[PDB]
């Protein structure tokens, strides 16, 4: 996260490190045994990390559970991003309490203006690279559909959409994908690409929620 702020420890609960022997990508609990990431995050041996805040030091409210199965989208396209969505299954259920809590499917989509608070360990600065140890937070306006399709010509699908400020200066970032955007305390987007981090006329590109909801159900119910 670019320009944001601290968020305090298990301020966001809902928030997880997915780890492979270090912090790569963030997602986002969704029932005891689910997470939500994305699908450009898919690797085997993942370590979902809950209860998080200073990723290098163990504090107390953690509780770290391997993955049992991943589920990439059925139409992930990793050239277009489109579909930049999966789900992670848990071997064994977390303890569900105050820090570590799951995140509201949305029921329906959320309109441009709306703000969201976008999350993650991803570097923080827009030039140059710094990765923060403790949870980085971000307040950011979802953007109209149009003036995300004219900052990014031929790339934006309805799966997707911008959040944050088309003057730059406050963006999620490397690291941050995979992570929440909760708006109105329903998780809407994913964090999925940008060109670059906080610059000028290219805001962040989100992976579109609400789209994947009845997905997200019956995959659940079955697996
Ligand atoms: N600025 C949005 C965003 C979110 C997640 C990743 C990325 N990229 C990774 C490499 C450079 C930008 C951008
Ligand atoms: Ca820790």
Redesign the pocket.
Known sequence: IVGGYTCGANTVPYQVSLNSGYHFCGGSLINSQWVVSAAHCYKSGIQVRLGEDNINVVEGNEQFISASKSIVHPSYNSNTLNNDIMLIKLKSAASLNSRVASISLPTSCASAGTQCLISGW?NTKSSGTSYPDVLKCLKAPILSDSSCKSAYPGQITSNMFCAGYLEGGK????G??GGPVVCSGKLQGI????????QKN????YTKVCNYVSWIKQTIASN
């Open positions: 991803g963006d999620s970032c490397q941050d994908s964090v999925s690409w940008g060109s670059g981090c906080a290219k805001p962040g590109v």
